[PDB]
Amino acid sequence: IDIDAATKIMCSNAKAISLNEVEKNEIISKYREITAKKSERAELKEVEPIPLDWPSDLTLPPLPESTNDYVWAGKRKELLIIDGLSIVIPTYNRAKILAITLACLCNQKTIYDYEVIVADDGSKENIEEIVREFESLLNIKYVRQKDYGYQLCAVRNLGLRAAKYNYVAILDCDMAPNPLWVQSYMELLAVDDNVALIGPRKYIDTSKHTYLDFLSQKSLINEIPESVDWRIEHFKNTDNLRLCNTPFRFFSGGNVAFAKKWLFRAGWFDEEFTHWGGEDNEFGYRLYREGCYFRSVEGAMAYHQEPPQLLQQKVPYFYRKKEKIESATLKRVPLVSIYIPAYNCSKYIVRCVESALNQTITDLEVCICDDGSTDDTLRILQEHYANHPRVRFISQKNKGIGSASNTAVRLCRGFYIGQLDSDDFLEPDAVELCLDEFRKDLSLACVYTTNRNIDREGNLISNGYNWPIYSREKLTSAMICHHFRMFTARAWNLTEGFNESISNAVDYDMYLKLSEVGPFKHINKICYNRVLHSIKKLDIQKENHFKVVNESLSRLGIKKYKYSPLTNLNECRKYTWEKI
Amino acid sequence: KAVIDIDAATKIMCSNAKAISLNEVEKNEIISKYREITAKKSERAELKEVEPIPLDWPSDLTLPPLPESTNDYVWAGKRKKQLIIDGLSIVIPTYNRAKILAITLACLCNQKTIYDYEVIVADDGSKENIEEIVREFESLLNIKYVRQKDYGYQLCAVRNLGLRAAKYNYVAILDCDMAPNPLWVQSYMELLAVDDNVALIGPRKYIDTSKHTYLDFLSQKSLINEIPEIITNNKSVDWRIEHFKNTDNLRLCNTPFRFFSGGNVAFAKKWLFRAGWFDEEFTHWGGEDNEFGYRLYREGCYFRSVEGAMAYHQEPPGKENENITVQLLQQKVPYFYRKKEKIESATLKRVPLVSIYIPAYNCSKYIVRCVESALNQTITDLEVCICDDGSTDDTLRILQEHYANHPRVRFISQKNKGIGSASNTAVRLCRGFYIGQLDSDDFLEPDAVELCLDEFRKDLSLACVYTTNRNIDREGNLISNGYNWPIYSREKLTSAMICHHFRMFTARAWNLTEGFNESISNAVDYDMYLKLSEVGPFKHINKICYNRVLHGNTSIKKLDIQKENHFKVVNESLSRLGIKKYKYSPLTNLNECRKYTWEKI
Numbered sequence A: 001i002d003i004d005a006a007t008k009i010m011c012s013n014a015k016a017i018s019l020n021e022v023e024k025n026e027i028i029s030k031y032r033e034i035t036a037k038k039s040e041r042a043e044l045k046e047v048e049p050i051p052l053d054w055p056s057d058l059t060l061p062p063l064p065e066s067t068n069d070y071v072w073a074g075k076r077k078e079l080l081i082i083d084g085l086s087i088v089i090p091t092y093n094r095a096k097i098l099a100i101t102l103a104c105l106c107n108q109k110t111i112y113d114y115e116v117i118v119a120d121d122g123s124k125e126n127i128e129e130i131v132r133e134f135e136s137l138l139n140i141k142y143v144r145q146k147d148y149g150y151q152l153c154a155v156r157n158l159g160l161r162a163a164k165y166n167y168v169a170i171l172d173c174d175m176a177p178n179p180l181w182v183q184s185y186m187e188l189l190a191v192d193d194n195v196a197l198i199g200p201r202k203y204i205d206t207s208k209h210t211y212l213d214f215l216s217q218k219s220l221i222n223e224i225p226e227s228v229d230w231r232i233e234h235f236k237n238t239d240n241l242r243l244c245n246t247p248f249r250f251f252s253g254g255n256v257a258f259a260k261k262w263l264f265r266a267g268w269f270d271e272e273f274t275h276w277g278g279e280d281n282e283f284g285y286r287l288y289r290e291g292c293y294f295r296s297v298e299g300a301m302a303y304h305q306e307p308p309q310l311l312q313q314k315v316p317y318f319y320r321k322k323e324k325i326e327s328a329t330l331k332r333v334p335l336v337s338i339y340i341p342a343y344n345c346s347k348y349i350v351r352c353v354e355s356a357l358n359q360t361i362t363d364l365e366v367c368i369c370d371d372g373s374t375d376d377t378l379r380i381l382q383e384h385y386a387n388h389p390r391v392r393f394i395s396q397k398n399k400g401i402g403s404a405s406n407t408a409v410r411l412c413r414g415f416y417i418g419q420l421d422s423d424d425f426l427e428p429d430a431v432e433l434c435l436d437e438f439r440k441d442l443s444l445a446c447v448y449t450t451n452r453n454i455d456r457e458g459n460l461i462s463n464g465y466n467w468p469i470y471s472r473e474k475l476t477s478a479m480i481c482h483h484f485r486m487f488t489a490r491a492w493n494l495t496e497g498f499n500e501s502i503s504n505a506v507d508y509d510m511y512l513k514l515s516e517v518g519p520f521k522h523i524n525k526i527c528y529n530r531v532l533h534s535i536k537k538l539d540i541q542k543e544n545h546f547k548v549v550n551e552s553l554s555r556l557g558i559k560k561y562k563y564s565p566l567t568n569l570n571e572c573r574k575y576t577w578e579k580i
Numbered sequence B: 001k002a003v004i005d006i007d008a009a010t011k012i013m014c015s016n017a018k019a020i021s022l023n024e025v026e027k028n029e030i031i032s033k034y035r036e037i038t039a040k041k042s043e044r045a046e047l048k049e050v051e052p053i054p055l056d057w058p059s060d061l062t063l064p065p066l067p068e069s070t071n072d073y074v075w076a077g078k079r080k081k082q083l084i085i086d087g088l089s090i091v092i093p094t095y096n097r098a099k100i101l102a103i104t105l106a107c108l109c110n111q112k113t114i115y116d117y118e119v120i121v122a123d124d125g126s127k128e129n130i131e132e133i134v135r136e137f138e139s140l141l142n143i144k145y146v147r148q149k150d151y152g153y154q155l156c157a158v159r160n161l162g163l164r165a166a167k168y169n170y171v172a173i174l175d176c177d178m179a180p181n182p183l184w185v186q187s188y189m190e191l192l193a194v195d196d197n198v199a200l201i202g203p204r205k206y207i208d209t210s211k212h213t214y215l216d217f218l219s220q221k222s223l224i225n226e227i228p229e230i231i232t233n234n235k236s237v238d239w240r241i242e243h244f245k246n247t248d249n250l251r252l253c254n255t256p257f258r259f260f261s262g263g264n265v266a267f268a269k270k271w272l273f274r275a276g277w278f279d280e281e282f283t284h285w286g287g288e289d290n291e292f293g294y295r296l297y298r299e300g301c302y303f304r305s306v307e308g309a310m311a312y313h314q315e316p317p318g319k320e321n322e323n324i325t326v327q328l329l330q331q332k333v334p335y336f337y338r339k340k341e342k343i344e345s346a347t348l349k350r351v352p353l354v355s356i357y358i359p360a361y362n363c364s365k366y367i368v369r370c371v372e373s374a375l376n377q378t379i380t381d382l383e384v385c386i387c388d389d390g391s392t393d394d395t396l397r398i399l400q401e402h403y404a405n406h407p408r409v410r411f412i413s414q415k416n417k418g419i420g421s422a423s424n425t426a427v428r429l430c431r432g433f434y435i436g437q438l439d440s441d442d443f444l445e446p447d448a449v450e451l452c453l454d455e456f457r458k459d460l461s462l463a464c465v466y467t468t469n470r471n472i473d474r475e476g477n478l479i480s481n482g483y484n485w486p487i488y489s490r491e492k493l494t495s496a497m498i499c500h501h502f503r504m505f506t507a508r509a510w511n512l513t514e515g516f517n518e519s520i521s522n523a524v525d526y527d528m529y530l531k532l533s534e535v536g537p538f539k540h541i542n543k544i545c546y547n548r549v550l551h552g553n554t555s556i557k558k559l560d561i562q563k564e565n566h567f568k569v570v571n572e573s574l575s576r577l578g579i580k581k582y583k584y585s586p587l588t589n590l591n592e593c594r595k596y597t598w599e600k601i
């Protein structure tokens, strides 16, 4: 009835359960032996990357240049009103300076409408006063909340709630915008509301200028001298973030614009960031994982007028550095999330879930979906993991494997997701191995190992099928994405999730949808154990789905070819490309 | 030398509107045309053995009772998902009443409730220093201040502003002169926590706080319930209170939005996404209240007056400046206020009274006839919304060459997704209240709509009215007088598809249902009307007002199997009514057979 060694240690470290130095390390010792076995390497062979009979004129649409290739995103297609831009200006009483920015906003040269919401975070100076001073020159609104500390996040969310248009832009009160600021944003958002926009900043002393100066001389901003925005170099070197895999690191909250639909898809600014900051990188980290893009805007230049690291807990993707077990403590947002789709898995679920909790990597969680199990899977799940801090389940009506998967994956909170079916089990270092490949090529959408075939009793049946080198062309020919697969949250959110209509091939289908968004990496080691177990019509629909899935992949705009069967023999998966 | 026209009625309304001009000759031509084109009358079918309820109908079987009203929030409550009761965002529209606003805020300081609430003061460009008031209360209330420039009477705009800024899932609206009693917040949230599909209306009292200040109120939080009532512009009273008790707090009221006073209400914020926001077109004349309430109504929301959410209307400054609502709502609230008019006077309305929906798929040679039959109705206050299920023929082009600019016809084309899908899409397109069905290959009689309408008026509780029809060849050839079941009964319908064409229903009743079934290749109509039969009372009209075209001769065996399948399914699905002690099975398993038998479980 006990819980895994790791989770127990982590709780103790965080001092939430008492454990004397003798038990603490008797449990640590136990955790070490249980995760000591390493993975056995599978066997390789002289394989050729691209299949031999791969159509000589057929060309798979190129992948993106990086996880953040908005250009690549642009040329992607399939299957809408630009009313204006809502400009939220978080302000903590820097009156005269605010007026200056406001002034610079009156001189905007754009074709789009734009309102201005001054977000006063309980200023002591009378800010309302200077806003009225502009009521005629601007479609300006005024918003204020009481003073209860450094509530930068709270105010940004108030102003954002107040915003009336489908597009918003955040701009600190000290950030004077150039004359083509508004225009440079709307110009881009209009083309793709799927990419967040970042504006560079410069530095200037506005001390020798009142707001009156900027109003009559609508260009004085592009003149005053000046310290360089550390990001600017990083910008041109990565073709305006187009080649960045960590774009949220450059998402400064003083000047950015994006489609308001992202607030609801990814959430708002974390109001917990009171004594910290990095809420930008955290907010943008969430946009990132939810499929949002980032592009740095040249014309979005603004001037920062001079004034008169627990991301560790919320951003696993790039910041969080691995910690030792004796130091390890649970994280608010875990790094790894193993999703499990369970149905009638009474006798195997525990071994399954435990094989996951007992991993080299303890910074993870397990999310399960009870797909209307008929046996007492749910009861086992309840008396074993109900009050467990690293395991979460949710029940529903049996809607099939695809549906169970989606529910399973939307439940995940981590960045790296792993698939573990309720009847199979992992090796104590599978997550770690895949993690290593991910940390090595931050462009990767998926990394998969191989496996071995197991008996429903445990007995060894045989080593699993193993195709040594991955290639998009080999996957589009045969399911070579052996199990255990571990795919990035972001990549998944760039696809249509799992197919809830097919009765099988649900996996071949997913990794097919994922093989379009990014580069996969294969590891030739056995880190998974898959169990194997009276129809001839059910096998009919089985070879149907295998084929259906491969051509649904046509969602790559390919019509000149059809991945057709070489025979109508159930068990056979031989193919042939027929022209049209 | 040929040409193409647009129906007479529509040509005539645009003329009577001075939006278009016709010479007397041409106009008289079109009027008399309309006069004859709509002179016919539906022929009444003949009744048969009046057998109310099926004898084979179980003796231990009772269907859950229908609501005692379109607004029976009690009936709504009992029915077959946890929400997050976070807080209550009170939006207070304000304009130059600093001292009066102060008292309001003070009373909001005296709230005895177990729920978290925020106060958003929405200032409609007041000159008085409203901000100073807010700041003077930040250490007592979780208050926010939202302000917009002065550009005339912008009540609706300032309400919306505050609402967009509201952080909770629940919102309230209290005019700055409405000093709430101490139980105000609690009396609302208590109810909102139980059912968020019902808006709440609070009563008001008239008193003068003239010789008082906000501190007098923070000092003794009962003073508000002690200030004597006064006579406003024996004292004045909320004209709605004798109505709240006469209809079990609106529970028995059929036109509940008439009491939705924007000065003291509360409701889930989700409704703003469903019914919309406050129409910023309204003026200092008023009306926005009811019209918003009216939309809330057509989308499914229920109304309930709350005795515990009473507020006190503080007499205005005094330095302050010193009839019929039908006129104001007329154009935008068709439901109750709208009344018919004759052709030579009739004019187009902002929100049509009737919306005829059409699910069209490869109906190239019938579509125009179809649409024109709806446009040539005795009832001219009507519109047609068509959804083309991505047809293969030239349907879309016809729609375009014929109605792309029609003021009373609207359409949208998607990719084929079945009849069920197109029905939803077409209904979602409708903007009227009373909506009728018209399949693209059929067509109506010139008095169909009206007849149905006359029944709706007579009984505002009805969810649907339907007539009987006749069968047509693929060219207008009379085949036979379609099936007709004399009297309606929920029991009979659950036993047999007795809801024949033409069917009309309330946009609301439809919104109280779950829409059309998009996973069944057929039996869609049975399903839908079955979904409505559980929501309200039907009324059958024994007259042939619809012409049904029989084309299926081509019925590829298996397709006839599923058509049998789904038929059973629909009735089964009607299980969502709680009924578990029974089943509705196919007596014989002969394809075209429809006989049944109830089996126990």
Ligand SMILES: O=C(O)[C@H]1O[C@H](OP(=O)(O)OP(=O)(O)OC[C@H]2O[C@@H](n3ccc(=O)[nH]c3=O)[C@H](O)[C@@H]2O)[C@H](O)[C@@H](O)[C@@H]1O
Binding pocket: A089, A090, A091, A092, A093, A121, A149, A150, A151, A152, A155, A171, A172, A173, A174, A252, A253, A254, A277, A278, A280
């Ligand atoms: O380069 C960065 O990493 C940071 O630059 C800016 O911030 P910064 O110029 O460093 O700080 P301030 O200008 O002093 O404050 C930022 C904003 O917080 C607001 N603020 C400050 C204090 C307060 O109590 N409430 C409040 O809303 C100010 O109005 C201002 O708009 C951005 O606001 C940060 O989000 C960003 O992370």
Ligand SMILES: O=C(O)[C@H]1O[C@H](OP(=O)(O)OP(=O)(O)OC[C@H]2O[C@@H](n3ccc(=O)[nH]c3=O)[C@H](O)[C@@H]2O)[C@H](O)[C@@H](O)[C@@H]1O
Binding pocket: A340, A341, A342, A343, A344, A345, A371, A398, A400, A401, A404, A420, A421, A422, A423, A483, A503, A504, A505, A506, A507, A508
């Ligand atoms: O073609 C597919 O969809 C599947 O092919 C193989 O899976 P396989 O072992 O053949 O099939 P199962 O083990 O029965 O199904 C995979 C998972 O779905 C769950 N499942 C299955 C059936 C069901 O109705 N509901 C449900 O949740 C199972 O418990 C299991 O965890 C792959 O290993 C799966 O990951 C992939 O989803």
Ligand SMILES: O=C(O)[C@H]1O[C@H](OP(=O)(O)OP(=O)(O)OC[C@H]2O[C@@H](n3ccc(=O)[nH]c3=O)[C@H](O)[C@@H]2O)[C@H](O)[C@@H](O)[C@@H]1O
Binding pocket: B358, B359, B360, B361, B362, B363, B389, B416, B417, B418, B419, B422, B438, B439, B440, B441, B521, B522, B523, B524, B525, B526, B552
């Ligand atoms: O069981 C049903 O759901 C239908 O049965 C009969 O309809 P029927 O004449 O048999 O079928 P159709 O005439 O082929 O289709 C009904 C309407 O849906 C449209 N439709 C049909 C097929 C489709 O894929 N999409 C689509 O929009 C058609 O144009 C037509 O107006 C009834 O007369 C219909 O009122 C009812 O909707």
Ligand SMILES: O=c1ccn([C@@H]2O[C@H](COP(=O)(O)OP(=O)(O)O)[C@@H](O)[C@H]2O)c(=O)[nH]1
Binding pocket: B092, B093, B094, B095, B124, B152, B153, B154, B155, B158, B174, B175, B176, B177
């Ligand atoms: O230009 C205006 C005038 C009034 N109001 C608000 O509209 C509501 C109704 O005003 P009033 O009390 O005069 O309405 P009555 O009591 O006459 O119905 C109050 O919340 C006012 O603060 C407003 O927002 N803008």
Ligand SMILES: [Mn+2]
Binding pocket: A172, A174, A304
């Ligand atoms: Mn700054």
Ligand SMILES: [Mn+2]
Binding pocket: A421, A423, A424, A531
């Ligand atoms: Mn399995």
Ligand SMILES: [Mn+2]
Binding pocket: B175, B177, B313
């Ligand atoms: Mn008033």
Ligand SMILES: [Mn+2]
Binding pocket: B439, B441, B442, B549
């Ligand atoms: Mn038909």
